[PDB]
């Protein structure tokens with residue numbers, strides 16, 4: 764089991780960490796969602812699907828910088844919504860193919876009432892997402908750590 768980002772940066776068998784740089788909607792009003800869709804950014808596959816079933820969870824998601832300060836967060840994992848920053852490990856997603864499949868993660872961030880101005884700074888760390896991979900074959904328990912960075916400022920109108 765291994766994963767790669769949209770630009771080809773990979774985390775190999777056994778886990779590790781990688782940076783993900785995301786474009787963000789430049790203007791987000793109070794009452795609206797800023798969507799950070801990682802399903803277009805992170806892709807994974809099973810290296811031995813003939814025999815092994817891989818189990819993949821969002822073990823946890825943490826918020827940083829402007830996102831922690833200025834937004835109220837929800838994460839959708841495989842279509843279901845949970846608090847972000849997270850409060851529990853999600854249900855599993857199975858990877859049973861050698862063909863790359865998106866990691867079905869998206870953040871939905873809505874400004875808090877005190878938010879206004881540059882709510883996310885370009886280049887800043889906005890989130891850390893931990894992908895946990897196990898299987899039905901052995902005792903492997905690996906973490907793939909995704910450090911999410913903003914490519915641009917996000918302005919919340921006042």
Ligand SMILES: CCCCCCCO[C@@H]1C[C@@H](O)[C@H](O)[C@@H](CO)O1
Nearest residue numbers: 764776808809810811815817898903
């Ligand atoms: C003949 C025996 C061959 C064993 C191959 C094991 C490959 O393991 C990796 C990491 C597992 O954690 C993972 O479950 C597996 C499949 O994605 O890929």
